[PDB]
Symmetry: none
Subunit: 147 residues, 10 copies
């Protein structure tokens, strides 16, 4: 019942990460104009439904590992190690760029967390792993879209 605390804490941050992410992901959708902003929409939409479920997968685990997932704004700014999204109603070319860097962060933490878990809660590692999969893939989608 000791190590089960450390675990529930990495996942807690991750929850917030996802929440801020999927929140931001919606922010971009609304704030995109210029070129093929539709191509962006059709790219962000499924990333929102997914990143959203991730925050749900990550939540229930914390619940199971004897603890309460905090998914409120005030909460997801306490865990937040980085800063708010800055791009207003701008371009795809500036937005994808913004998102490129957002993921630079999400991708990393996720890694430096899957990396922190082996010895602790493996069932939880795999979760954050399968996630990193689609996480990293999307950040590429963002990149190719922009070359």
């Amino acid at each position: 019942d000791k190590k089960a605390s450390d675990v529930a804490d990495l996942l807690q941050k991750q929850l917030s990460t996802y929440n801020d992410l999927h929140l931001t992901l919606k922010h971009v959708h609304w704030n995109v104009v210029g070129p093929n902003f539709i191509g962006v929409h059709e790219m962000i939409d499924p990333q929102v439904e997914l990143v959203r479920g991730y925050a749900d997968e990550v939540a229930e685990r914390i619940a199971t590992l004897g603890k309460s997932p905090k998914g409120t704004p005030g909460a997801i700014i306490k865990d937040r190690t980085w800063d708010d999204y800055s791009v207003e109603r701008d371009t795809v070319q500036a937005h994808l760029a913004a998102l490129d860097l957002v993921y630079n962060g999400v991708i990393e933490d996720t890694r430096k967390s899957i990396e922190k878990l082996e010895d602790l809660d493996l069932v939880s590692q795999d979760l954050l792993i399968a996630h990193a999969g689609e996480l990293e893939k999307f950040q590429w989608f963002v990149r190719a879209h922009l070359e």
Copy 2:
């Protein structure tokens, strides 16, 4: 231009209102334990969606009016005027209890904006009122425990 500027601000306030709201529902969703707790799960769901999309409709007008909707963890706490949500792993009565409270101020705020518009924007008003309806009916349902 300036009228549109203030309609936005109002709609920006509402945007955040909603965004905090649908983020809460999921929170109460992951943390509601109890005997018939699954009915809360069952009620949160259609709502979570309903709200998530209402946040969408308002972020359409803000942009329409030439202003940038802001639905990020900052924007929400920045123009907020309520607490977070104190309820953790708790009982059906516990959430349903504060969940009701949440929907009071939320509609209170809404009921104001709908009037704070009247003069200004008919269209954007004819919107928030509709929101107020489904926001009421739900609470009405939340208000009916045991």
Copy 3:
């Protein structure tokens, strides 16, 4: 040869799964009173899952090169606990005893997982699965009573 030791873990694991989707089918058979259906609505689906994890782990055994033993005599053989006592009763009563069964299953599954990191990651990724799912049904059950 190497698989001859990993086959052991999985063969014990299977039988645990066989025990369970028998025991689990047992309580679903034996409950009366208050909330009748809500339980069969929660158990049925899990029943099918444990039969799944039974069928799967078995296959993985027949794959590594041994005859997966899945007969009653093959169960009690590797079983390391007493049978399931609770006969007819209520929901709050079975779910309570059911909780401790799982603690056992989870425990050993969790245990068997830690034992595989060095021998067969395939079989592990497969336990890792049943693990995370089973644990949900713990919390789930745990959360039906207050």
Copy 4:
């Protein structure tokens, strides 16, 4: 009255189906060779069908006031036969040693139906269906002429 005199049979008939179906899966994981999917395709519809019989004679013990034990121990205790022991083996084998298994079950299902004549009036007729159906499978299985 005559109730607790009949139960000692519908139990050793519920467990009959239990040891029957559980063996089905066991064989299902071991039938190997040219037309092995042959066996696979014929076991699956029975497995569930025989599971449907474990149920029918599990409820008519709860209804007829009692608690049917569908657990490991509640099988090795009232087991009147021996554990199915065909390993990872050819269709040829399993189908044969599966003819016998069915013959014996249809042997009990014969004696018991007859030993429950001038007592119960519908339990016998429910049981008759299984005698009817379980028999039907043997035909198909007795097409072990390949």
Copy 5:
């Protein structure tokens, strides 16, 4: 950075294993004949559909890692390490026999890579960890002796 080049390198080698495989696989589909020969069909189609999938998967993965995949026949001979599948218009016990050995090659190699990535990129490892499960599964099934 260097590591990613040695992950992409293994993943590229793995890719060619899937490409040669599903080509080989379909190839078999066309020449397996006899009595219950459709069995081989009914058996093969999903594996081909699956191996082809894994290809796209491990490919997209290399793409994600900053190296670009190679699905061309020159690229799969340029990093194979075994000769083309042999059997032509033959029997079930003939193809299945060889196809076993083929998969011996696949799995044995897939395992190598898993253990070899265990110290580089678990994400990619999860990817192979998964396939491995299925590949080995087919192997068993192929062993309708």
Copy 6:
């Protein structure tokens, strides 16, 4: 049954042409990037399944005509008269360009194989005739985005 062999030999050469085609096609799917890159995706998919289909159609044919179709890397190469596809991760207005070229040779040989089939087999010709249409068409589709 001496001219049938000649037909087959043509079809086999056609076979490897398709195989190299669909492998190459997916190879571009995986590498094409830029703003409109998903567009190329969208055009390539229906083609890739189409081609894979032809590959099947032709083999089945050879096999029918009493010869044995070859679908392995060597085979593809052995009867290949062209250069391996050469673009890596690259722009649309690049992959389509090189892909435009690939197709000319495909269509060229497909025309040739047709004419050569004139006095040989109208059936094989009719098959190849069909493909030619969806292949020639696809190239227009390729040289329109250019």
Copy 7:
């Protein structure tokens, strides 16, 4: 080229047949009266959609073959051979009988173009063999007295 252009023409002439054919097909839908008039709409509706398809299939082909299918009206009145459906609002019969006569001079030309291509463009010919057999049924259909 040298020839491909000639093909493009046989095909262009065809396109206008098709266009002027569905312009006309619709024309009668509008102008049909009488008792069993819905028996007509019933058969026309799906043929209109079909003949528009063909128009496309042909247009995209001309496009594939070097360029510029022309589908405007001044382009129809041009490479047309026939008059112009003169029938107005009339008996089902009054139309079917007339329409029957239209399909004649279409199949007639469509048959010419096929023969005309056995030596020029085998791929395109395949495309007009597809339509030929279809339109021809519809005329048999129309020949429901």
Copy 8:
């Protein structure tokens, strides 16, 4: 009045008949990186205009007359020229189409300024279209 109307309606019919022949025409002829953006914006609009013809045709049958829908009539009662543009780029065709629609929307606006003295019913069917046609032009002018 409805022979002064069955005229305007017929002139309208062909405007729609020409439009949708000409529309499917630019569809076949667009080329360049994103000619599909056009393909994907012509399609529904093509079914629409065909729809519009379909309608104004019924109207001409109701007022007890004959809808003329053959190439003959179209060239006859029209007052403009064939769509000039062949295989050309998207900016090329969109510009032409944007110009094509003025004529059609402009003419339609006229038949509406007329039908107000004669048959509001049709003058309504026409108003409907005008707005929808007006909107396609908008959508179309969005190109850069």
Copy 9:
């Protein structure tokens, strides 16, 4: 006024070759026995629904050309060029085999009718060419050597 008279009759022989074939097929289906015997059922059945299908196409095509399709036991014995299926309740091998025999005849006759049509009727040709594809294919399928 005669181009058809020859062609149509040419299609009628074809039509009856099918009407025969699909009953024979159905015949075999009621007469295959022994070990597994169902491999045949799963094989034949789809094929009958195919042949019965071809029976129409060609009948309709006969009907479309101007003459009348005669698909009654009368014609299928008259324009026949062989003898009835001579196999009763027998094994798969001796049956599937004898069925292979039937196909040789059906393909050879068709190939002939396909040639005869070269410069005569291409639509009726790219209709037989179509059947020959699936008819040859079956004969192969059949050949469970």
Copy 10:
């Protein structure tokens, strides 16, 4: 002793169902005029049943140890009545003959069900159900009013 001539009457019934559906499709490829689909519409689902009867009347000939003869020359042999005889002909002309067709079919079925009073079991629980839905069809004909 009569066992061989009991099912003998079924082999008779067998071919009739054949001749019947073969006829149907013939009339089907030939019924024409204003409301010809009208006849098509009613004929299709019937052919299913009729062919099913020939499947059901064969699933029996087989069981009591006998070879079901379902070939063209088997019909004309164990036949009695007249080969059909109507091509491109009016709506009523076919319905009319399709009537008479069934009469001789209904007549015999009953004349056989009767000859099977003191003999076969499910046969006298079969040809009725048949004769039922057959006799049914016969009324469904009668050309409106």
